[PDB]
Amino acid sequence: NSIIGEKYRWPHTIPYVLEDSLEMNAKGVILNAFERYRLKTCIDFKPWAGETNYISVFKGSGCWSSVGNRRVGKQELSIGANCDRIATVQHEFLHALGFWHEQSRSDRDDYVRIMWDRILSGREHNFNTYSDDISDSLNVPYDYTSVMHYSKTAFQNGTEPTIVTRISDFEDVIGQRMDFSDSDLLKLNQLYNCSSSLSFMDSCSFELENVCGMIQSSGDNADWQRVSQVPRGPESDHSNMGQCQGSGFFMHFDSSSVNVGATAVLESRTLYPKRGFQCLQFYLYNSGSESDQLNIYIREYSADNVDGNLTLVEEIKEIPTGSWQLYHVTLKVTKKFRVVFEGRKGSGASLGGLSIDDINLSETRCPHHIWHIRNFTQFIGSPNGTLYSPPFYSSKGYAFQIYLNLAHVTNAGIYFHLISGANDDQLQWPCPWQQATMTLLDQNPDIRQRMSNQRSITTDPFMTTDNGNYFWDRPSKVGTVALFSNGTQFRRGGGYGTSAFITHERLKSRDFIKGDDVYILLTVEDISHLNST
Amino acid sequence: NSIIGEKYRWPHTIPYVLEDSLEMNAKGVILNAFERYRLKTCIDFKPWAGETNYISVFKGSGCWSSVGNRRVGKQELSIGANCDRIATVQHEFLHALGFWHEQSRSDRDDYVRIMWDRILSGREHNFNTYSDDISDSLNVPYDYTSVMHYSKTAFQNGTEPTIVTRISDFEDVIGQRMDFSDSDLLKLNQLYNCSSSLSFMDSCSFELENVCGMIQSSGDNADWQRVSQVPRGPESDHSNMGQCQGSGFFMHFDSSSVNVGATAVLESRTLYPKRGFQCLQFYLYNSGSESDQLNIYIREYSADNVDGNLTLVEEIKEIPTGSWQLYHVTLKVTKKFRVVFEGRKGSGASLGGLSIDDINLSETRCPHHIWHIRNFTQFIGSPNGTLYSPPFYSSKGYAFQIYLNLAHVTNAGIYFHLISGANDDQLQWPCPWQQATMTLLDQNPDIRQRMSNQRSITTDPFMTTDNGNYFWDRPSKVGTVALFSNGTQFRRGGGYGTSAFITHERLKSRDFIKGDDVYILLTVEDISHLNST
Ligand SMILES: *[C@@H]1O[C@H](CO)[C@@H](O[C@@H]2O[C@H](CO)[C@@H](O[C@@H]3O[C@H](CO[C@H]4O[C@H](CO[C@H]5O[C@H](CO)[C@@H](O)[C@H](O)[C@@H]5O[C@H]5O[C@H](CO)[C@@H](O)[C@H](O)[C@@H]5O)[C@@H](O)[C@H](O[C@H]5O[C@H](CO)[C@@H](O)[C@H](O)[C@@H]5O)[C@@H]4O)[C@@H](O)[C@H](O[C@H]4O[C@H](CO)[C@@H](O)[C@H](O)[C@@H]4O[C@H]4O[C@H](CO)[C@@H](O)[C@H](O)[C@@H]4O)[C@@H]3O)[C@H](O)[C@H]2NC(C)=O)[C@H](O)[C@H]1NC(C)=O
Ligand SMILES: *[C@@H]1O[C@H](CO)[C@@H](O[C@@H]2O[C@H](CO)[C@@H](O[C@@H]3O[C@H](CO[C@H]4O[C@H](CO[C@H]5O[C@H](CO)[C@@H](O)[C@H](O)[C@@H]5O[C@H]5O[C@H](CO)[C@@H](O)[C@H](O)[C@@H]5O)[C@@H](O)[C@H](O[C@H]5O[C@H](CO)[C@@H](O)[C@H](O)[C@@H]5O)[C@@H]4O)[C@@H](O)[C@H](O[C@H]4O[C@H](CO)[C@@H](O)[C@H](O)[C@@H]4O)[C@@H]3O)[C@H](O)[C@H]2NC(C)=O)[C@H](O)[C@H]1NC(C)=O
Ligand SMILES: *[C@@H]1O[C@H](CO)[C@@H](O[C@@H]2O[C@H](CO)[C@@H](O)[C@H](O)[C@H]2NC(C)=O)[C@H](O)[C@H]1NC(C)=O
Ligand SMILES: *[C@@H]1O[C@H](CO)[C@@H](O[C@@H]2O[C@H](CO)[C@@H](O)[C@H](O)[C@H]2NC(C)=O)[C@H](O)[C@H]1NC(C)=O
Ligand SMILES: O=C(CN(Cc1cccc(C(=O)O)c1)Cc1cccc(C(=O)O)c1)NO
Ligand SMILES: O=C(CN(Cc1cccc(C(=O)O)c1)Cc1cccc(C(=O)O)c1)NO
Ligand SMILES: *[C@@H]1O[C@H](CO)[C@@H](O)[C@H](O)[C@H]1NC(C)=O
Ligand SMILES: *[C@@H]1O[C@H](CO)[C@@H](O)[C@H](O)[C@H]1NC(C)=O
Ligand SMILES: *[C@@H]1O[C@H](CO)[C@@H](O)[C@H](O)[C@H]1NC(C)=O
Ligand SMILES: *[C@@H]1O[C@H](CO)[C@@H](O)[C@H](O)[C@H]1NC(C)=O
Ligand SMILES: *[C@@H]1O[C@H](CO)[C@@H](O)[C@H](O)[C@H]1NC(C)=O
Ligand SMILES: [Ca+2]
Ligand SMILES: [Ca+2]
Ligand SMILES: [Ca+2]
Ligand SMILES: [Ca+2]
Ligand SMILES: [Cl-]
Ligand SMILES: [Cl-]
Ligand SMILES: [Zn+2]
Ligand SMILES: [Zn+2]
């Protein structure tokens, strides 16, 4: 579904302009989409600085883009109303990069049947097919899960689908708008001879005996052990969760059989950063004591320190026992370096130890907060599936809470709530231009194969409610009464998001649910600086 | 371990000359090595035709090459005596393409320990390291399995190893000379922006519900079913063989519940050939009748029949029941086409069906013959581990037999025997310049991830034995008496190969043994046309 012709290729770095017609939330979402390209492709984006051909993103009618580099100078790409979704931006830029819709493939009739009699009159022009002399599928099979594939209802007249998948099980699969599919990357990365990405650094699941090049320190008291189980926990690794026999390993620091203060250090291979900011993430399991801790250091190398200088970046203490726990550690390294995992036994009694698995490192921004939902499957489609996150404080001081609604039969909804907080007396009301990004984590061991489902909203301080109040005003003024889990009363403002965050079927696909656990990643950022672009 | 500098890159297609000093067997092995590059990389090779810089392969002392395009015009690469091994040629050309040995990495001391007290005087320079200002490891961890990594005995004085891997399990792993490692390809394909290969077409294991783009035909009597088990067999697929719970699927044609002559047709996606010759391979399981057959067709597309005209290429009949069977089908397609699998029920009664799994298609030469060894593990290191293949006939008419000796404690040996045959009266004796290629198949589901162990020998008609006879003379004249399994007597000539075909440890690694089955692939080709190159 790629356009044939070297004249349609962009440079690997695309110049762009974010026109002022774009909504605030749209501008932030667009910049997020660029981050995804930087993680999984060799395509990059930079502000236009006089280049002849560039992309002008503006709030036109609908979401659309030309296919390929048209070399017309200013090439328009429309992110109109309701197009402010990261998957939609990725989709539109795949058009710009030279891709038609998946159902436009020359072989599309072998996999889907277009119901022309059920298309709305005047809408049949979007269901075209391109022959193999102008369209090249790059030796990749037809991809129902493509982010460039319409859903079954596209431009439908009535309740009857316009696109019918011959493999009936794919009827509701087509139309996913979560992230690149594996084939989307295969085709794009092939079309642009992509050898590496900007933001990806390392992914380690310990499934090979060389443990991703990590080295055991000799100036310590114990070694991390590559094991597939620990008696007291965990019974299996996090990557496979015991699915495959003889597979599924993790590194374990046995704190039960060492003295207080003893340490085991595991250091990563040498890494060369390109951006100056990184996010280190990994899953931890604690079957020992709450006094045991994991310390993260950064060993930076320079001409001044050829041996490398250590810097403590985070101490992870009081680790919950009995379940895998996701952690994020923010880094700001600019020189070649290693990551250091030091497991230290505390004074408390331990009968197990610390386990680490599914490590990923990328030159990306960490999420500000994480919502970890245990025993999640019971709530899908259940009346008691009305879930509220713990209270969090945004970077600017606003207290907020997340509402995830799984009670309805087909769709899951997610909403961002402001709640009463300790800084409300000194905060700006109504909440102005705070972009809340909510991401349902696709818990694939490899960050490169994650199709996380992400939606963003921006608080508009002029939005009002039916009774005349400002929607994002101080929760004590406009919010309803709510009770914390501990019984403490608080005020919860209006919730804003979408009732169509993710379908229950997609929620049960891939690795959104893993170990009956779900993780929702949260970032609340002031984007008022995007008003002028 | 890659050399830094854009001037050290070759063109993707390297011009080469095979000097007349090269041994006959070496010339054939080199051309075989090129086929591996064409299968797994974007590197190609063409005979030198006046290009300024080209590679001149000649029979120097030992096996060596410069690192990278040195832009000195004629750049020599030595394949001397005993260097005529496909993995050694691949290794030497990885040098030419710009790679140092893996243990020369700047971080090599974190993974291996050099026992300097054990190096031969004057050979310690061979263990030097290149810093990261001239060497780039391309963000790939240290690779013990690299084809560019010395074995533990390199330049050793005595019986004690010079290179000790700090992860002890890799002590005997380093030094593998079977094929590219996965990391070797990751680095090379990254260094030359390889987006695709010349010879790879498709790999299908049916592990995704879209079944690699294969189509179910409507003009037949039944459908192939994507299943993970069949009551009468097989109990699991061939890819995973029940290793992973809920995973491992194959396509099944149920002959038990259809009439005589009924067919189920599965057609592949559209394919575009580049070379004019292809090899289709796949694994079959038969739990039905001995009269059931699998027919392979090719649907070629042309201006004459836009719908496509079918051509029968092979009829697979009398399929042994109760075990997975590997098949190879030779193709000669030059226009865009599909592969067509037609399962046909015979007249016999059936309680099962035909199963197909782990299909691979590449623009490569099929092996002429295959030796399938059942219940293989019992013979490893056993006194009764002296195995003889069935008799085969080479393309020129010579009858031959393969001898695999597993009785030695550490090494497996393989030998090529000429045997008495029905054309011996009219054959040229002594056997002149017939190259026998013996390949222990690494039965990975994906052909692209196979590290098959291959050795080749060429019959020298002047080679003599101690008693004055020609080694490769007519077996009736110079051979010993032997009995086929059915009791029929024949004459077996001398066996030539190596007692160090593969170590037992490597033999038990990866997928050489799969389902307790081993496949040895055989090609005997006249290479007398290579005397003048
Ligand atoms: C115990 O087990 C033992 C081991 O299995 C077993 O021994 C085997 O017994 C069987 C049965 O008796 C023997 O089978 C015979 O094999 C012969 C050899 O076949 C191979 O070689 C053929 C000839 O190749 C030459 O010609 C080709 C082109 O024609 C060239 O491409 C070659 O380069 C080669 O040229 C060279 O040789 C020429 C001299 O012949 C010379 O002029 C020329 O210049 C050059 O030097 C190939 O055609 C043949 O390929 C076919 O068969 C194989 C099967 O293995 C397939 O895989 C191939 O795809 C292809 O189909 C082999 O490579 C055969 O000639 C002989 O065939 C004849 O008979 C059968 C059965 O009736 C017919 O199907 C066939 O058409 C032939 O019929 C012709 O001849 C007969 C008279 O001979 C005649 O009646 C008929 O009308 C017609 O004229 C037969 O298959 C086998 O050889 C034995 N193996 C060994 C190792 O010895 C033993 O019996 C068992 N014991 C018991 C008790 O059961
Ligand atoms: C039942 O459950 C409920 C639900 O949890 C419980 O309710 C909680 O109870 C606890 C304890 O009583 C409360 O803790 C208190 O929290 C407040 C707020 O913390 C957050 O904000 C801090 C201030 O942020 C402002 O300032 C920073 C710079 O200082 C700035 O960067 C920010 O952007 C923000 O700026 C804005 O606000 C300013 C006014 O404050 C303006 O001037 C400015 O212009 C801006 O408008 C912040 O410091 C803090 O960050 C730290 O802590 C978090 C979490 O611990 C951590 O993640 C960070 O890394 C930091 O380490 C938070 O973001 C806090 O101010 C209180 O601390 C003060 O008081 C104590 C006691 O004297 C001192 O020790 C401190 O030093 C400090 O002086 C206190 O921690 C919590 O707020 C409350 N939650 C809710 C939702 O109600 C309830 O208690 C439970 N009931 C029972 C019975 O158990
Ligand atoms: C990906 O790499 C290929 C191979 O180098 C590039 O193809 C070349 O493009 C130039 C510019 O038009 C042509 O003159 C050459 O003939 C092409 N070579 C081949 C073998 O086709 C291609 O341009 C690269 N893609 C991008 C997006 O840069
Ligand atoms: C692989 O592609 C890269 C582009 O990403 C090529 O690197 C460029 O090479 C040209 C010419 O040598 C230089 O002018 C550029 O500065 C390079 N750009 C970058 C980003 O490195 C490289 O030449 C290609 N390699 C091969 C073997 O074709
Ligand atoms: O693919 C697109 C959007 N698509 C139409 C569409 C709209 C809603 C749902 C679906 C679906 O998949 O269910 C598809 C085509 C298009 C082309 C030009 C203009 C507009 C417009 O928005 O007016 C829309 N954009 O690139
Ligand atoms: O790398 C190699 C092989 N050679 C380097 C070499 C080349 C030419 C001459 C000599 C020499 O001094 O005679 C040595 C090192 C080697 C040889 C044998 C076994 C192993 C091993 O891996 O054990 C390593 N060529 O590119
Ligand atoms: C949609 O279908 C209805 C029912 O056939 C018809 O009345 C109407 O005109 C159609 N509208 C369009 C835009 O196709
Ligand atoms: C929620 O409801 C589901 C379905 O009715 C039930 O299985 C589950 O136990 C309930 N959860 C809690 C925490 O009560
Ligand atoms: C090898 O070691 C032996 C044992 O000490 C020594 O006598 C000999 O000189 C050494 N040879 C070389 C070439 O290092
Ligand atoms: C060969 O010997 C091994 C062990 O010595 C034994 O397990 C196997 O069954 C034997 N195979 C035979 C006798 O065919
Ligand atoms: C030697 O090689 C040339 C070149 O291919 C070939 O034509 C010739 O026949 C070969 N010699 C013999 C005896 O086959
Ligand atoms: Ca793991
Ligand atoms: Ca240690
Ligand atoms: Ca399979
Ligand atoms: Ca059918
Ligand atoms: Cl992530
Ligand atoms: Cl193969
Ligand atoms: Zn589109
Ligand atoms: Zn070498």
User: What single string gives the DSSP state of each residue in B271-289?
Assistant: B--SSS-EEEEEEEEE-S-
- Is B92 a residue of the active site? yes
CB contact under 8 A, B195 and A196: no
C-alpha distances (whole Å) from B107 to each of A269, A273, B104, B475 are: 8, 17, 8, 55
User: Do residues A435 and A493 share a domain?
Assistant: yes
Q: Determine which residue's CA is closest to atom 9 belonging to ligand 10.
A: B378
Q: Determine the Cα–Cα distance for residues B242 and A247; give it in Å rounded to an integer.
A: 13
Q: Decide which of A368, A393, A415 is a domain's last residue.
A: A368
- DSSP 8-state code for residue B238: S
State the helix-helix crossing angle for B182-191 and B86-97, rounded to 10 degrees.
Answer: 30
Yes or no: say if B153 and B172 are a contact pair by the CB < 8 Å rule: no
User: Do residues A71 and A166 share a domain?
Assistant: yes
Name A115's Cβ contacts closer than 8 Å, sequence gap at least 6: A160, A161, A162, A163, A164
Within 13 A of B457's CA, how many CA atoms are on the CB side? 18
User: Do residues B345 and B396 share a domain?
Assistant: no
- DSSP 8-state code for residue B157: S
CB pairs < 8 Å spanning A and B: 93
Q: Determine the Cα–Cα distance for residues B390 and B421; give it in Å rounded to an integer.
A: 13
**Residue B272 with chain A: CB contacts under 8 Å:** 139
Question: Could you tell me the two tokens for A16?
Answer: 């762009």
| Phi and psi torsions of B44, nearest 5° | -125, 170
Element (H, E) at B418: strand B411-419
Element (H, E) at B470: none
CB contact under 8 A, A269 and B193: no
Q: Determine the Cα–Cα distance for residues B531 and B533; give it in Å rounded to an integer.
A: 6
* Other Cβ atoms closer than 10 A to B488: 9
Q: Strands B13-18 and B54-58: what pairing?
A: parallel
B195 → closest Cβ in A190, A210, A244: A190
Q: Determine the Cα–Cα distance for residues B363 and B312; give it in Å rounded to an integer.
A: 19
User: Do residues A127 and A248 share a domain?
Assistant: no
Q: How far is the CA of A477 from the centre of ligand 17 (A)?
A: 72
- DSSP 8-state code for residue A32: H
CA nearest B214 in A: which residue? A141
Question: Could you tell me the two tokens for A401?
Answer: 């809470």
Q: Decide which of A157, A175, A198 is a domain's last residue.
A: A198
Name A529's Cβ contacts closer than 8 Å, sequence gap at least 6: none
Q: How far is the CA of A367 from the centre of ligand 18 (A)?
A: 29
Count of domains forming chain A: 3
**Domain region containing A231:** 199-368
Distance of CA A262 to the CA centre of its chain: 36
A368 is in an annotated binding site: no
Question: Could you tell me the two tokens for A311?
Answer: 């810097």
Q: Determine the distance in angstroms separating the CA of A106 from the nearest CA of chain B, rounded to an integer.
A: 10
Q: Determine the Cα–Cα distance for residues A459 and A474; give it in Å rounded to an integer.
A: 12
**Residue B131 with chain A: CB contacts under 8 Å:** none
E strand spans, A301-409: 309-316, 325-331, 337-344, 353-362, 369-373, 386-388, 392-393, 399-405
User: Would you say how long chain A is, in residues?
Assistant: 533
Virtual torsion, Cα A290, A293, A294, A299, nearest 10 deg: 170
Secondary structure (3-state) at A456:
strand
Q: Determine the Cα–Cα distance for residues B519 and B70; give it in Å rounded to an integer.
A: 41
Q: Determine the distance in angstroms separating the CA of B457 from the nearest CA of chain A, rounded to an integer.
A: 35
**Residue A120, ligand 7, Cβ within 6 A:** yes
User: Do residues B458 and B309 share a domain?
Assistant: no
CA angle B487, B489, B493 (to 5 degrees): 130
Ligand nearest to the CA of B433: 11
* Other Cβ atoms closer than 10 A to B277: 15
Residue whose entry in the numeric block shows the structure tokens 């690494």: B442
User: Do residues A359 and A373 share a domain?
Assistant: no
User: Do residues A256 and A317 share a domain?
Assistant: yes
CB contact under 8 A, B132 and A336: yes
Residue whose entry in the numeric block shows the structure tokens 């997610």: A414
User: Do residues A394 and A514 share a domain?
Assistant: yes
Q: Determine the Cα–Cα distance for residues A59 and A89; give it in Å rounded to an integer.
A: 12
Q: Determine the Cα–Cα distance for residues A398 and A316; give it in Å rounded to an integer.
A: 25
CA neighbor of A168 nearest in space, from B53, B209, B319 = B209
Name A488's Cβ contacts closer than 8 Å, sequence gap at least 6: none
Resolution to 1 decimal, in Å? 2.4
What HEC string does B45-67 produce? Answer: EEECCCCCCEEEEECCCCEEECC
Q: Determine which residue's CA is closest to atom 22 belonging to ligand 1.
A: B397
C-alpha distances (whole Å) from B352 to each of A31, B231, B232, B292 are: 56, 8, 6, 10
CA neighbor of B515 nearest in space, from B233, B206, B242 = B242
CA nearest A109 in B: which residue? B215
Virtual torsion, Cα A157, A160, A162, A163, nearest 10 deg: 160
* Other Cβ atoms closer than 10 A to A49: 7
- DSSP letters, B487-517, are S-EEEEEEEEEEEEEEEHHHHTSTTSSBTTB
Experimental method: X-ray
User: Would you say how long chain B is, in residues?
Assistant: 533
Q: Determine the Cα–Cα distance for residues B293 and B317; give it in Å rounded to an integer.
A: 5
Q: Determine the Cα–Cα distance for residues A128 and A124; give it in Å rounded to an integer.
A: 8
Yes or no: say if B284 and B358 are a contact pair by the CB < 8 Å rule: no
Q: Determine the Cα–Cα distance for residues B33 and B83; give it in Å rounded to an integer.
A: 12
Q: Determine the Cα–Cα distance for residues B438 and B436; give it in Å rounded to an integer.
A: 7
Q: Determine the distance in angstroms separating the CA of B272 from the nearest CA of chain A, rounded to an integer.
A: 8
Residue whose entry in the numeric block shows the structure tokens 């990278």: B68
C-alpha distances (whole Å) from A397 to each of A492, B227, B295 are: 16, 55, 71
Nearest atom of ligand 6 to the alpha carbon of B95:
26
User: Do residues A3 and A133 share a domain?
Assistant: yes
Q: Decide which of B316, B336, B368 is a domain's last residue.
A: B368
**Residue A190 with chain B: CB contacts under 8 Å:** 195-196
- DSSP 8-state code for residue A271: B
Residue whose entry in the numeric block shows the structure tokens 């030359």: B192
Q: Catalytic pick from B23, B92, B207, B342?
A: B92
C-alpha distances (whole Å) from A167 to each of A118, A252, B248 are: 20, 44, 19
CA neighbor of B440 nearest in space, from B357, B371, B366, B391 = B371
User: Do residues A355 and A424 share a domain?
Assistant: no
**Secondary-structure breakdown of chain A: helix, strand, coil percentages, each rounded to the nearest 5:** 15, 35, 50
Secondary structure (3-state) at B388:
strand
**Secondary-structure breakdown of chain B: helix, strand, coil percentages, each rounded to the nearest 5:** 15, 35, 50
Element (H, E) at A463: none
Q: Determine the Cα–Cα distance for residues B283 and B438; give it in Å rounded to an integer.
A: 20
Question: Could you tell me the two tokens for A261?
Answer: 């203060």
- DSSP 8-state code for residue A427: S
Q: How far is the CA of B407 from the centre of ligand 10 (A)?
A: 11
User: Do residues B153 and B291 share a domain?
Assistant: no
Name A34's Cβ contacts closer than 8 Å, sequence gap at least 6: A44, A45
- DSSP 8-state code for residue B226: E
CA neighbor of B453 nearest in space, from B412, B409, B486 = B412
Q: Annotated binding residues of B, as ranges?
A: 91, 95, 101
Q: Determine the Cα–Cα distance for residues A156 and A166; give it in Å rounded to an integer.
A: 18
User: Do residues B531 and B403 share a domain?
Assistant: yes
